[PDB]
Symmetry: C3
Subunit: 277 residues, 3 copies
């Protein structure tokens, strides 16, 4: 069961000690990172939580994934420190997580600064699988790191349009769009009106997705009644986020200069994706 | 529920108005067209039904797919007119049909002669997806069109050999054959005898499929008792028809100069495939 | 039902007559042969059983698959004779075995020395599928054939380390390993100790699989208490054996000069894989 944040580490050379009984979340998160073509993952460990940061290849999307120490089975970190992980190196490791593993344990030791330990346990046969992954002390992408500030509950006022999609709905919408376009217009008139997602390709195909019941997608709008909100957004990274099916239910927030924020939470994991322009 | 053919269109500029609560049939039919490497689909709309015509790439197979107006939820057409659809343009649209869509609506308007409208509805969340597809007024392949006459119930006398396969059986037989050959011999002696499907590849492999019980595959024969019926037929297009699993139960008819007709019906859709030589 | 070995063949020109009601075993065995990149299969028929021999492409692994006549539905062979089968020729035939076939029959006739007959029966519709496969009188790989002697119950004394994996466990272990390495160290200290599977790749990743409960994997050891057993083995062929999921439960035996033997039995089939170095 879940004991949360510990005052002292079970092992003594431990700078980080983490244990969690849903290792499948790491698999799906790293499938997301693969889909974004992230080459290197930035990791911040603090005494209260571990955060994974990355950009997509186009550098336009920012991903921040937080795992809350108080909501995992065991958590200890001595202080604030950073690690760099080559994503390709760990891809197959995280993809190897399946139903046979009921625990993931992560350890980082003072006396082995370039190693990160991942331990998977199969309890049916007392099998323990230990990975020693070479990691580095990373140069910090400060723009990426500070994007976290730009996703506080308080900072989300200038987001006049927001709604929720299930994983299935998000995947469907952006798969359907991606079939024919890289760009989509999001439009909504002020007031009690439908949400429009649409595009036009001259002399071939135009497509229009209209959501007639705001209530059914939990849409909230503060668009002034007489105004039209209309932004044009890129959808590549959204397909990635969708397919990765990491969550359950995804909150989507739009801002008038075209930034799009996707948020989902599921137990200990909080996933944020911010895409600009 | 199903209201069939209407006297007047709900919308007024409508030359065609079509609605149907099993949109999955369009998906499977267009998977068939893709498998046949059809580049362009010919469409005839009349006040009683809509028919889709195509040839396969080899031009040897003729496909005629009819959707009966009286058996759909809503149908209206002003007169007889023709439309041409680029198959590749609409491929992803039709492939996007899934369980979330409970209705497909098709509209063609007088004042927009180069547009065909496809509307899909998700009733769980009041989501409406509207495609505007560029279409053309087609030059008519008259040989293709008149192949329809060559599939009337009356015209099927000179077919002395016929039987039925389930979708599963058809797929199995022509997948098994396609593994090793492009051509198969169909042979049946007059009288109460087994059906043979077979081929020979010198110094590698010969294969023989024998159906010992005519009753179990609903075989009917008018081959004179003392005669042998034997034709050699190409099977590529048949694999396509099979894999597309559009139907349930497929009637197969053979003629002595080697033409092969496949027919299946399921609610509003009637699918005919004629292959020559 | 199972009548076992017959004194006389139903047909009279038969040198071999074989029938069996689990044809799926042939499919999975030939998937194994495909995974090993076996080009030619050696077949020994005797009056008591039929044996399939092959090497993998690297020639380091030896596969011996025996089907016991007394445990099949019908078996007859006149004497000891050998056949050679091109694996690629028969690949699609064996892959075509599915749920619709409840019987496989194999026949070899005196008067047709270069033909091997495979007959599959679908009893739902009285359909009989007969393959005539060109085969040859093979030059004998005597090293391969005599590897059978090196797998007698008696010869397995100098195997001080052995345990059992389910199909799922074997696939998991060698898929996990194959992600990152071609070679693995198997290590076990004498006495009541854990089994180690591990490797090291400098400056990227090391991996260690430890089995803490010998009982749970049915491990038996005769390693002297004060000694360490340690061998380095190649794993490619093991992935093949695993994925082919031919069995249920697989016995693994290790010898101090690095040979690894895998054995599984399921009804009439006994499968042995010996890999050297």
């Amino acid at each position: 069961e879940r004991k949360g944040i510990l005052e002292k580490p079970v092992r003594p050379q431990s700078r980080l000690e983490f244990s969690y009984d849903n290792p499948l979340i790491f698999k799906n998160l790293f499938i997301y990172f693969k889909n974004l073509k992230s080459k290197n993952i930035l990791v911040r460990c603090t005494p209260t939580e571990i955060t994974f940061f990355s950009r997509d290849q186009s550098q336009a999307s920012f991903v921040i994934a937080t795992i809350d120490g108080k909501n995992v089975n065991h958590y200890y970190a001595s202080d604030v420190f950073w690690l760099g992980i080559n994503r390709e190196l760990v891809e197959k490791m995280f993809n190897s997580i399946d139903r046979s593993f009921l625990k993931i344990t992560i350890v980082h030791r003072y006396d082995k600064p370039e190693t990160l330990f991942f331990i998977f346990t199969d309890f049916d046969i007392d099998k323990e699988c230990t990975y020693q992954i070479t990691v580095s002390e990373p140069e910090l992408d400060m723009d990426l790191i500070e994007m976290e500030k730009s996703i506080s509950e308080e900072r989300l006022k200038n987001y006049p349009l927001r709604w929720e999609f299930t994983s299935k709905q998000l995947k469907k919408t952006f798969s359907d769009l991606s079939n024919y376009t890289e760009l989509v217009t999001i439009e909504k008139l002020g007031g009690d009106t439908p949400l429009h997602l649409y595009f036009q390709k001259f002399n071939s195909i135009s497509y229009h997705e209209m959501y007639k019941s705001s209530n059914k997608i939990n849409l909230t709008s503060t668009i002034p009644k007489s105004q039209v909100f209309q932004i044009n957004v890129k959808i590549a990274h959204i397909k990635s986020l969708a397919s990765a099916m990491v969550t359950d239910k995804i909150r989507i927030l739009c801002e008038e200069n075209g930034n799009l924020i996707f948020q989902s939470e599921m137990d200990a994991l909080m996933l944020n994706t911010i895409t600009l322009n």
